[PDB]
Design a protein around this nucleic acid. Structure first.
Lengths: 277, 226, 19, 58
RNA sequence: AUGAACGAGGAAUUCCCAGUAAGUGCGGGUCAUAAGCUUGCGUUGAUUAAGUCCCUGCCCUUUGUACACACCGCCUCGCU
RNA sequence: UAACAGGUCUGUGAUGCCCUGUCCGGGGCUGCACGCGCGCUACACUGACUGGCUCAGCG
RNA sequence: GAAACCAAAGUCUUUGGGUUCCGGGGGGAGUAUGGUUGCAAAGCUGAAACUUAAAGGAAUUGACGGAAGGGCACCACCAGG
């Protein structure tokens, strides 16, 4: 899909809040409209493109311009490569790589100022989902934890070529700097356990044998480190059940929990020596 | 290659009309790729032969390398004292140059040759695809290639265009004097990127019933209606 | 053009107070 | 007789290109204003450049 | 009196299965004089094959299933 | 008797239509940069020169 | 019976054996709202404003660039001269 409308591109550039000294990381450069516009509007434009022929097209289009030296092209898959420093990110992203890449943008260091993202309507609405919405998912709670998100403007697909399947949308994202003091591996593991079945209660979510296996591993690690003598008649599931009733989340379901409830649950589980890693 | 022995090379240098016309499509081909003026570029000459197109390229200040398979073409090109360099080889096996090498490519009457299977090991489509992929390899990114031909039918055209669009080249072809016969040339230019009542009266006609004659006043507003 | 009988087309399933 | 031959071979080339197009989309991704009505030939036009015809590749 | 090119000829294809191709000469028509076209004639006399629809051209049978047309989906932005 | 899709012949319709060259002298009848096709000659040693010998047919 | 077809989908303008549920052009829309059941997922009930000239069922059909099966031909091919 190649974005061809100039005025929607201008709206993205304007509401991205560019500066003349900013470094811009661009994903999905397309045919070279917004690339050369960023080159006119930024100090350095880092365009990431896997296909070498698209790189050749972009390099030909920026050739002969005074802004040719300000463009740096990263050839390769953006998911595996190490992203350099940038002040502002802009991206025309495919659906298939949409979700982990955002997490990469959540885990990129050092912190940037802003990122403007093109998404599908399904992904964009799941991204900004409030608790109680049917589109609430792990992406919603994780991105509302680590960052602040705003759904900006609903984009028609006649601006692209070829026009995609579902409608298009624009998302403005910025990480919270400093981030909240929550271990993101721990948070993501706990949320991964709780969203195995989202309409099922946390008690029955923690009755699962795989959950018992992983928590047995982590509790054995904790007892090995801190020299805690495990009783023979110990039941990890009984422990989890009585802590979950001690917290008040036994009868609550995972689709109706906000960030604060998961924070309380993780605080209780970590205070009881249960870790998810 | 065995056409161009000493005899046919001596014929080729001794042909006023052929030299004049090769100069003409050499000039048109050099005009057709938009290389910048006052910038001496680096070009690949394909079907150089005696180097007539190469001589035209050297006349305009550009530097070029010729590629051919006939020894007598390259021998007579040396005998004509050309300025560029020559290489003895076939495009179908691949052009042996690094990526990012040639600022432009000019092929003169050398691309209709690979469209037929002459040996049992040979294959026209795969040889043409290898030729186009090697062109896409050795050309610098953002360059242009002009390829001159006289297609005898559209089978050669469809094979050449499929193998060109399958190797990553973008562009098209332009025909000089398409309606003419003596001046018609093919240049494949590639680069690395009231009606209602009328219908109702017809409906009543197909239903076979009597209808009024169809005249000027068929659909016409009589007067304003209040 | 009108497709023939050999062309596979499946039949659709139809499913204040007065004061 | 030869005029019809020219017309049919031009039509054959055009239809062969138009049938080349769909597999080119699947497996992968003309001088009408320059006609001379009085006789066969090619007459210059003032608004447009020297006669040509561009059919882009897909 | 002189011995130019001509060193077996790169990519359209022409004709052909027995006294045939090819080599080789000889007649008729056109003709106050050409030798160059077409018709035949005789002499020496070969290679491959008794096959095919791969291409071309022609004649059949079926079909409007395949592609295309058609179905449906997807189908420009920016202030007051 | 008959028949003229072969026709012929200075006759009849103010019959329908379209308009209001000979002899004489000389030159030229592919003159040639060429693309488009048929032919002849050879591109040598299974050959060229010279001399001798010995076989036809349609007309 | 509109026809596909039905021994019932018959005994029906020559219109009445008994009785139950249920439709009233296409959408809006199984939506909003209220009630009610459910641990939850959801289930049952269920509009209007407005908008439109159609929506839908059954069957018979010429031509149609083409497509496939065969056959023939040294003015087509294989091997050759």
């Amino acid at each position: 899909h190649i974005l061809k409308n100039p005025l929607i591109i201008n709206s993205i550039i304007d509401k991205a809040a560019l500066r003349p000294t900013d470094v811009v990381l661009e994903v999905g450069p397309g045919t070279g409209n917004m690339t050369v516009k960023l080159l006119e509007k930024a100090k350095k434009v880092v365009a990431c493109e896997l296909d070498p022929r698209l790189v050749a097209e972009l390099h030909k289009r920026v050739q002969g311009t005074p802004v040719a030296s300000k463009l740096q092209v990263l050839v390769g898959d953006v998911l595996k490569t190490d992203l350099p420093f940038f002040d502002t990110c802009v991206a025309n992203l495919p659906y298939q790589i949409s979700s982990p890449f955002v997490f990469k943008l959540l885990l990129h260091r050092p912190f940037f100022r802003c990122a403007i993202l093109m998404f599908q309507r399904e992904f964009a609405l799941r991204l900004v989902a409030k608790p109680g919405d049917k589109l609430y998912c792990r992406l919603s709670i994780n991105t509302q934890l680590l960052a602040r998100v705003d759904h900006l403007m609903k984009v028609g697909k006649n601006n692209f070529r070829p026009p995609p399947k579902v409608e298009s949308s624009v998302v403005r994202i910025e990480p919270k700097n400093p981030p909240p003091p929550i271990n993101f591996q721990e948070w993501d593991g706990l949320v991964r356990i709780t969203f195995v079945r989202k309409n099922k209660t946390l008690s029955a979510a923690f009755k699962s044998s795989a959950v018992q296996q992983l928590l047995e591993k982590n509790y054995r690690i904790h007892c090995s480190v801190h020299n805690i003598i495990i009783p023979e008649d110990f039941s990890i599931a009984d422990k989890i059940q009585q802590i979950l009733t001690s917290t008040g989340f036994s009868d609550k379901r995972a689709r109706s929990m906000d960030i604060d409830d998961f924070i309380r649950l993780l605080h209780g589980f970590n205070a009881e020596g249960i870790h998810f890693s | 290659e065995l056409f161009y022995d000493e005899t046919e090379a001596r014929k080729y240098v001794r042909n006023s009309r052929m030299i004049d016309i090769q100069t003409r499509m050499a000039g048109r081909a050099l005009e057709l790729l938009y290389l910048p003026e006052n910038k001496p570029c680096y070009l690949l000459d394909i079907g150089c032969g005696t180097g007539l197109s190469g001589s035209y390229l050297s006349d305009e200040g550009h530097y070029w390398v010729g590629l051919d398979i006939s020894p007598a073409m390259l021998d007579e090109a040396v005998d004509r004292e050309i300025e560029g360099d020559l290489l003895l080889g076939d495009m179908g096996q691949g052009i042996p140059f690094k990526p990012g090498t040639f600022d432009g490519c000019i092929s003169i009457s050398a691309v209709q040759w690979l469209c037929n299977a002459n040996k049992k090991s040979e294959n026209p489509a795969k040889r043409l695809y290898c030729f186009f992929a090697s062109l896409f390899s050795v050309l610098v990114r953002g360059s242009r290639a002009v390829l001159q031909l006289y297609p005898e039918n559209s089978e050669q055209l469809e094979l050449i265009t499929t193998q060109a669009t399958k190797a990553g080249f973008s562009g098209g072809m332009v025909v000089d004097y398409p309606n003419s016969a003596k001046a018609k040339k093919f240049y494949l230019c590639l680069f690395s990127g009231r009606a209602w009542v009328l219908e109702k009266k017809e409906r009543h006609r197909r239903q076979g019933r009597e209808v009024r004659p169809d005249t000027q006043y068929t659909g016409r507003k009589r007067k304003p209606r209040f | 053009h009108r497709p023939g009988p050999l062309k596979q087309q499946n039949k659709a399933h139809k499913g204040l107070s007065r004061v | 007789r030869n005029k019809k031959h020219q017309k049919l071979k031009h039509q054959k080339e055009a239809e062969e290109e138009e049938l080349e197009i769909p597999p080119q989309y699947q497996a992968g991704g003309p001088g009408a204003e320059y006609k001379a009505k009085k006789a066969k030939g090619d007459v210059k036009k003032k608004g447009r450049p020297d006669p040509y015809a561009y059919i882009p590749l897909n």
